[PDB]
Design a protein around this motif. Structure first.
Motif, short mmCIF file in Angstrom:
data_model
loop_
_atom_site.label_atom_id
_atom_site.label_comp_id
_atom_site.label_asym_id
_atom_site.label_seq_id
_atom_site.Cartn_x
_atom_site.Cartn_y
_atom_site.Cartn_z
N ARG A 170 9.33 -24.27 7.25
CA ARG A 170 10.05 -24.61 8.48
C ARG A 170 11.38 -23.90 8.64
NH1 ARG A 170 9.82 -30.98 9.21
NH2 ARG A 170 10.20 -30.28 11.37
N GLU A 175 -8.01 -19.17 -2.33
CA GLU A 175 -9.10 -19.99 -2.90
C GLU A 175 -9.47 -21.24 -2.14
OE1 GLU A 175 -11.24 -22.96 -5.12
OE2 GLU A 175 -9.13 -23.20 -4.57
N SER A 176 -10.75 -21.61 -2.22
CA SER A 176 -11.26 -22.84 -1.62
C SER A 176 -10.77 -23.20 -0.23
CB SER A 176 -11.02 -24.03 -2.55
OG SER A 176 -12.23 -24.50 -3.17
N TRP A 177 -10.20 -24.41 -0.10
CA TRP A 177 -9.70 -24.88 1.18
C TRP A 177 -8.31 -24.32 1.51
CZ3 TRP A 177 -10.61 -30.85 2.27
CH2 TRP A 177 -11.96 -31.16 2.03
N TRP A 178 -7.68 -23.61 0.57
CA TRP A 178 -6.31 -23.16 0.89
C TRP A 178 -6.09 -22.32 2.12
CZ3 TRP A 178 -2.88 -26.28 -0.71
CH2 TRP A 178 -3.01 -26.94 -1.93
N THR A 184 -7.58 -22.48 4.86
CA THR A 184 -7.67 -23.42 5.98
C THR A 184 -6.42 -24.29 6.06
OG1 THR A 184 -10.06 -23.55 5.90
CG2 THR A 184 -8.94 -25.40 6.99
N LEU A 185 -6.00 -24.85 4.92
CA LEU A 185 -4.81 -25.71 4.93
C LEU A 185 -3.57 -24.92 5.31
CD1 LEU A 185 -5.48 -27.74 1.76
CD2 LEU A 185 -6.17 -28.24 4.08
N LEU A 222 -3.55 -24.40 9.03
CA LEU A 222 -3.10 -25.59 9.76
C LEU A 222 -1.59 -25.75 9.71
CD1 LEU A 222 -5.74 -28.11 8.61
CD2 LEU A 222 -5.57 -27.20 10.88
N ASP A 253 1.17 -25.84 12.67
CA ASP A 253 2.02 -27.01 12.83
C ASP A 253 3.49 -26.63 12.91
OD1 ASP A 253 0.07 -28.95 10.45
OD2 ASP A 253 -0.29 -28.39 12.59
N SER A 254 3.88 -25.61 12.14
CA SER A 254 5.28 -25.18 12.08
C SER A 254 5.49 -23.97 13.00
CB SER A 254 5.62 -24.84 10.62
OG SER A 254 6.97 -24.43 10.45
N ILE A 264 6.00 -40.21 2.22
CA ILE A 264 4.61 -39.88 1.98
C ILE A 264 4.30 -38.39 1.99
CG2 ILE A 264 2.23 -40.09 2.94
CD1 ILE A 264 2.77 -43.07 3.24
N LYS A 300 5.50 -36.78 -1.24
CA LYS A 300 4.73 -37.21 -2.40
C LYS A 300 3.34 -36.56 -2.36
CE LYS A 300 5.17 -41.69 -1.63
NZ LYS A 300 5.25 -43.22 -1.80
N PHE A 301 2.73 -36.55 -1.19
CA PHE A 301 1.39 -36.01 -1.05
C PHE A 301 1.33 -34.53 -1.41
CE2 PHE A 301 -1.98 -33.91 1.50
CZ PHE A 301 -3.09 -34.67 1.17
N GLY A 332 1.68 -33.74 -5.17
CA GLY A 332 0.49 -34.07 -5.94
C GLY A 332 -0.65 -33.11 -5.62
N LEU A 333 -0.74 -32.69 -4.37
CA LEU A 333 -1.81 -31.78 -3.97
C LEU A 333 -1.70 -30.40 -4.61
CD1 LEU A 333 -4.17 -31.16 -1.72
CD2 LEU A 333 -2.27 -30.37 -0.38
#
Lengths: 280, 280
Positions: free
Chosen positions: A39, A153-156, A158-159, A162, A166-167, A220, A223-224, A227-228
């Motif tokens: 951001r 890798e994997s879902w990264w 895509t995430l 997103l 968003d930013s 949240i 923290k999320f 951990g992710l």
């Protein structure tokens, strides 16, 4: 004469056709490049908004450089202007950080283009490692604080796509193309570990576990996110050693969320190490 | 004044060994069960805190039931008390919603235990579909608003685990066991599509795309979560069609974030649909 010599500079970028703002505190020929998060604002770098970084590094024998701007840019060179949000130029942040800016700082502020440290967090944790992977003489030291270290890798992909939308409505496709494009693996720290090993780059990799301490950041999302991304960071540590990596510091404490107080705690923790590596 | 005043009831749950608070508006023998999100509070249901749901369904010919509580419960029956946060009993929300609460409302209010609608959002969007999959006589109608519709697949058990720990320190493994346990697929709406088809359940599935409108909810987490689960929702729609599903409404407009104003817009939009299916 004033106190801390914090400056606010306008550095021309031929590649982006505009002046890039850069906060600066001169204090030695080698510098710590403090990269911002996803951001990133156009007025001030997040390190000056959220931490006492300049005060902490004042009289450290190191200059401090905080580039301003580059929201969702990943401090990389994009293939084209972001398609969707009307961006009217192409981000060329890797060209700016590795060529334009160091040349200007050498000519105007006496800062060496070589022997510096790249320190990033979140979005820019991976950026710092990639800059050191490809420009080892400029960055013999790189720190990644809560970075996303296997973006291809994997879902990264895509995430990340997103999060960029968003930013500021940025488009990952305009940056590195679809996830099958070579630019994704080129800019993936996990994939480029062999380069970090071959160059014997000193790396400092940190990731908290999602549990807040007295330092704060108890929300949240913070923290999320911590951990992710911790799992990827642990895999990176393992892969680094398996690949012959032997110059890394890995801090995975039993606390920490994806927030500024922890990133600042690590910036303070690494100061002596950076002073040792860059200034001897 | 059909169903007024709105009432706050104490309904015993033998399975949980405690009384469950239920907000209730009468108005007809069939009811809309309005399930809360992941951060369900113990004082009032999120639908009442954030939307004019009761006023919108006043004089609709349908009763409205808002169970209170169940933070991170997924409205499911857990194997054991959440391990980590001190929970001193085992959540048995599927038993409460399918046996205990309907028996109480039938005996005392005349609400029919059969022929109702389960409406959920976020966490409870999948719960609503699972309740209809397994209790079709109770729920011939189910709506899922921005639900997580393939919880047993890929990274989802990991992400749900993180989210539950972030919302009250709840443990997803105390709920459905290790990811290899049968409870994960049992409670996965995508996996249970064949039951929804066999039962000819009327399903209403909504998901926004992450772009806010003047309705609000313009914050990064709300944008991110909506764009992330949209992909799963689109896959759910395709799989439902592929499996012979022919009784669904799929609403995927080019706007909406993971926030209450959009869920309320959908609740108002589906009123005529529910009235027609349940009362005519």
């Amino acid at each position: 004469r004033p106190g801390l010599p914090v400056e606010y500079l306008q550095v021309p970028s031929a590649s982006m056709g505009r002046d890039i703002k850069v906060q600066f505190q001169g204090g030695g020929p080698h510098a710590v490049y403090l990269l911002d998060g996803l951001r990133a604002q156009d007025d001030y770098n997040g390190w000056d908004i959220n931490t006492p970084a300049f005060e902490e590094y004042y009289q450290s024998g190191l200059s401090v450089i905080m580039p301003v701007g580059g929201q969702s840019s990943f401090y990389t060179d994009w293939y084209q202007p972001s398609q969707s949000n009307g961006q009217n130029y192409t981000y060329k942040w890797e060209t700016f950080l590795t060529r334009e800016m160091p040349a200007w700082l050498q000519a105007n502020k006496g800062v060496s283009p070589t022997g510096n440290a790249a320190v990033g967090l979140s979005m820019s944790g991976g950026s710092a490692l990639i800059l050191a992977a490809y420009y080892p003489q400029q960055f013999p030291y790189a720190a990644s604080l809560s970075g996303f270290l296997n973006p291809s890798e994997s879902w990264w992909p895509t995430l990340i796509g997103l999060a960029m939308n968003d930013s500021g409505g940025y488009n990952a496709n305009s940056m590195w193309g679809p996830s099958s494009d070579p630019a994704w693996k080129r800019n993936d720290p996990m994939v480029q570990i062999p380069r970090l090993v071959a160059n014997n780059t000193r790396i400092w990799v940190y990731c908290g576990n999602g549990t807040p301490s007295d330092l704060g950041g108890d929300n949240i999302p913070a923290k999320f996110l911590e951990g992710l991304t911790l799992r990827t960071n642990q895999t990176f540590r393992d892969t680094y050693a398996a690949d012959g990596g032997r110059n890394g510091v890995f801090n995975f404490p039993p606390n920490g969320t994806h927030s500024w107080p922890y990133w600042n705690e690590q910036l303070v923790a690494m100061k002596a190490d950076i002073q040792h590596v860059l200034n001897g």
